[PDB]
Structures are given as structure tokens and as C-alpha cells.
Design a protein around this ligand. Sequence first.
Ligand code: R95
Ligand code: R95
Ligand code: CL
Lengths: 296, 305
Amino acid sequence: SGFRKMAFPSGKVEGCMVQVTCGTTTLNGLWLDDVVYCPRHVINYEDLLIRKSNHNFLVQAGNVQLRVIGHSMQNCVLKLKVDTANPKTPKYKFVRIQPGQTFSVLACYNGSPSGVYQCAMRPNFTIKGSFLNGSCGSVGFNIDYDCVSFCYMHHMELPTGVHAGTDLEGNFYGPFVDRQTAQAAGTDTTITVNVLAWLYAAVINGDRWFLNRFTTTLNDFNLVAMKYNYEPLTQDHVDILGPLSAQTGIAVLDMCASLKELLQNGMNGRTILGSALLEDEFTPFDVVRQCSGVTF
Amino acid sequence: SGFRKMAFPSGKVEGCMVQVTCGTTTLNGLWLDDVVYCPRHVICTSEDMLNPNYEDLLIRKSNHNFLVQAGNVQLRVIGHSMQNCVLKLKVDTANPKTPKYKFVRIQPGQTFSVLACYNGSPSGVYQCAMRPNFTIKGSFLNGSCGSVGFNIDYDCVSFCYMHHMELPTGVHAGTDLEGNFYGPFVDRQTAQAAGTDTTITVNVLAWLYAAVINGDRWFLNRFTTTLNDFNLVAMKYNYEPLTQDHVDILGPLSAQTGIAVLDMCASLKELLQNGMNGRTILGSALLEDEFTPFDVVRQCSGVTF
Ligand SMILES: CN(CC#N)S(=O)(=O)N1Cc2ccc(Cl)cc2[C@H](C(=O)Nc2cncc3ccccc23)C1
Ligand SMILES: CN(CC#N)S(=O)(=O)N1Cc2ccc(Cl)cc2[C@H](C(=O)Nc2cncc3ccccc23)C1
Ligand SMILES: [Cl-]
């Protein structure tokens, strides 16, 4: 029993974290094989880059100074070729995630990991992270079997306190740019398929007060959900919730009627899994994984 | 900016997790140097759990009855001994991945990271706190016994908890790494229940100071309180008594934000009376009690917004 916001074990990622210094700027880099990946803002970026030499980039792995033997830019990421391959490089892939997907963040300062937390890519492409100055270059990831899938690299904080970053190929999540200019997160919405997954997790853990005898159509549910700034629920979301629907005996549209009643009438002094808000940062897969004990 | 429930990086602990098998029971062990630490109930059957005589069960076992697996390698057990509710299995190989470590016994209200494991393999990491009733509100399934709780301030791992059992309300009980249980619990299938739980007051105050540091003051008021009047009110909402030690511990956060501890106490009294009225504090509609004053200082910036 129990339901916690759970991150993947961070060990495979910890052995890749390094410190990158260029002039006055110090941030984090990801050392995989003989390449260190970091935000290009550590340095027109091609005009700034052409003026730099390999020796201008100071890379530190623990108490060892790595030697930079080459450099190149790919979108908003800088790739520093080093003369030593990371002996701790895990099996890995670079993957781009969609809004509503969750991942673990290993927050680092000066190339040293300080914490791990779980979070979700918001529909507005920002993440509600916990980062201070020096956290740039911290990475987001998932683990599937023994393979680390790197999906996020931290670049900046927006004026509302939320965060923005790129995939490991340097493409931003969101309409953001890596420069000091007027940028703002768009109006955000609630990840509906995730709230439904979290309601199924509550039923699995014995919390059933919100269940009712009613059902709804997908169209009527979406008309109601659009009114509360909830993301539209698609037939794909309904299909994805199939396993949890069969385990608990509550049809997806049956749980949608519960969600509609919670949205129109509130919780009324009651909580669900120790929360007085509807939680949207657990995917259907996270719920199945935490209620089954999948290991890495 | 931001404030998340943050766990310590688990790598140093992952390299210590092993699987321990004794007959039909399989659970997790912590391999540090040449010793594997695990719950002594690994030698029990489910029948034995009503009134186990661990000393009588243990004397009947030999070193080769304990199967220890580290990754895909079988470790050889060369000795065994019991210390309170933990079994210490001497192995013939020292763990080359043993970090710098200490065994520390924590007090209620203290937080720690849990590396939940099944079959000696880590599945997840989460942050939690020792409740005032000595239980933990964890996320554990069957096979999670032997999973450990820890803190890593600097490069030293301080092991503070080993998981032993789930109580009927879904909460969890366990021991320090010397095998002493937290609370009035026993490693027996006896009628045991968690006592009435309370809110960790010093932690809610720390979390209110974190909210002020991150730029939110809507909950503050122009009032102050004596420590005695605050405790008389707090006890009525099932909040733990606030001691002079707690007030002393909140000193640094008080000096950083410019808000006296008893003035923050007055704001808490008002929040308990009024609720949040549709508002949130650090993205939560409930008062959070699983961040200590130390966690707030570690995570938050040194410059108030
Ligand atoms: C006003 N700025 C951000 C804020 N507030 S700033 O500090 O001047 N900043 C400007 C800027 C612009 C573009 C890009 Cl890609 C990065 C940055 C930097 C940035 O965003 N850094 C930070 C990242 N993550 C958490 C941070 C918490 C605090 C400070 C800074 C953080 C540096
Ligand atoms: C009724 N039991 C617990 C429950 N429900 S039990 O499974 O029969 N259980 C009895 C028992 C008694 C004392 C001691 Cl020291 C250990 C145990 C075992 C135990 O607590 N195991 C588990 C630990 N942590 C989470 C668990 C979630 C699910 C199942 C089992 C878990 C085995
Ligand atoms: Cl303590």
C-alpha cells in the first residue's frame, strides 16, 4: 500500500554528471562516451562559438580535469569532444517526450548531483521544477529495462518560477528561446488522462468515496472538461486506461462521470491519496508500475 | 524558484542492494563491506510470524541455508549473527561499491529518502518522514522488506531505516540499521495498530517560511502569540506540541525572512481556523509537514523573494 511521487533510481545518471566552465559561467554537462553535452548558453551563437578554442572549455569529472579536443553545436546544445570516454556510460537513447509524459530530474550544481524528483512536461511545455542558479545542464530521464532514455536538459527559469529546456538534441520544449528576452509561459491546462490514472490508483489503494453509478459520453465529458481548463480526452487516452479499467471494474467513461462530479462539486472536506487537489503528474504507466513493483 | 519533494540521489545506495533468500522467503539486504544486513524475519514462515522464537529458528540454520545474490553473482555466506531485529550475514567478498557511511537513529519529524527494492533490484526513490506515531507513509508492496531509508548530506550516506512490515492501515514500520524498531512495534503478526497520528508542527512552520522565501505572503497576519497559547490551539487540530527547541531551530529562517517564529505561529493558527479559501501554498491545498527546517534551507535560495 501507499502512493508516492516516485522517481527512477538516479545512479546510472549520476555517473555521467560533470561541471563545465567557460569564462565566468559554470554549469552542468552530461558525459556520455567521449562527448559532454551542455546548454550552448555556457559560451549569434556561431559568432560567439567561432571565437572559442577547445582549451577555453574547462570540464571537470569529480576531481579530474577532462581535456576538450573538439566542439560543435546542435540546435541549443553544445557537444564537447573529450579525450576520455566515460567508463560509467550506461546503455542510453535520446528521446523527445510529449506534454503529459513524466520523467525524473537529477538536479545538479557544479557537476555534483544534489537531488532527484519526479515531474511532468506541462501542456504549456514548461516544467514545474525546483532549480536555483547553477542548475543549468541538469537532465530529465526515464529508465526502461537497463536503458536510460534522456529526454530533457535544463536551460532556464521563466518569470513565473517555472522552467524551460530542450531535448538532448537541443530542440526546445515550447516556444522558448535561449536568450534574455520577454518570454512567458502560456496558460496551462490539467492533464486529464493523468488525473484519471491517479483516480484509478486511489481506487486500487481503497479510496472509493468519489465513485458513482453514472456514466457519460466522451463528447459530454470533453464539453465539461474544456470548461475547467482540462486537456481534451481522446479515444487513445481511453484505450491507454483500458488495463486499469479492467483491474478495478470501473469503465473509463464511468470514472469520467466521477471526475465531472468532482469538478462541479469539489471534494467537500475530503482528500484522495492524501491530496485536496486533483493530481495530474502520474501517467497510466506510472500507476501500473508503482502498483506492480517494476525494477531496474 | 520552485519547491519539490526532493529525494537524495540514490546511486550510492543502489550499489549496496542485494537479494536474500532463506527457504521460500526472498527479500532485500544491504551489503556494506563484507556484511549483508537484512530483516531477521527472512528465517520465518508465515505460520512462525504469530509467535516466532528467532533464537530457536536461527540456531537451526547454517551459513549455506542463506542464499545472497548481488546482481548476477552468488555471494558466499561465511557467518551469521542476530542484532535486535536485524540479521547480519558475513560474506566472503567485500562490496567494492561500499560508500562512506554511518548508521544513525532518527527522531519523529525527520525526513529521509527511501530506495524501494524488489528481489535486490531498485525500482524507485521517494522522500518521506518518520511520523510522530513512529510509522512511515511509504509505498511498499510484498517483497519490499529490507529496502532502506537514508540521507546523504555531503558524500557520506547515513542509513536510518530498514523496512520490515505493513500495518493494517497501509502505513509502514521498520528499524534503524542496528535492528531497533521505531515505535512500539514488533516483528510478529500480532494485533498491532498505529497510534493516532499528528501533524509535525515545526515542519509546517518551515514550509510556511519556504513559501515566504519563494515570494508568497498572503497567509501572514498582524498578530503574534505566546508559545503556550499556540500549543493550546495546535493541540485542538491534532498538531504536535511546538517546543523551545523547535523555536530555536527555526531561528535561521526567521532571520532570513524577517518574520519572528511566534508571528509565523500566529499565521499558522489563523490558517487552521480559516482554511485556504480556494488558495494554495507552494502548489498545495493542504499544510505540508514532510519538509524539515534543514530541508528548506538546503533546497531554497539564500535570497528571499
Ligand atoms: C532572470 N534570469 C532567470 C531567472 N529567474 S537570469 O538569472 O538572468 N537568467 C537569464 C537566462 C536567459 C536565458 C537562458 Cl537560456 C538562461 C538564463 C539563466 C537562467 O534562467 N538560469 C536559471 C535556471 N534555473 C533556475 C534559475 C533560478 C534562479 C536564477 C536563474 C535560474 C540566467
Ligand atoms: C498481512 N501482512 C502485511 C500486510 N498487508 S503479511 O503480508 O501477512 N505480512 C505479515 C508480516 C508481519 C510482520 C512482519 Cl515483521 C512482516 C510481515 C510481512 C509484511 O508486512 N510484508 C510487507 C511489507 N511492506 C509492504 C507490504 C505490502 C503488502 C504485503 C506485504 C507487505 C508479511
Ligand atoms: Cl533526527
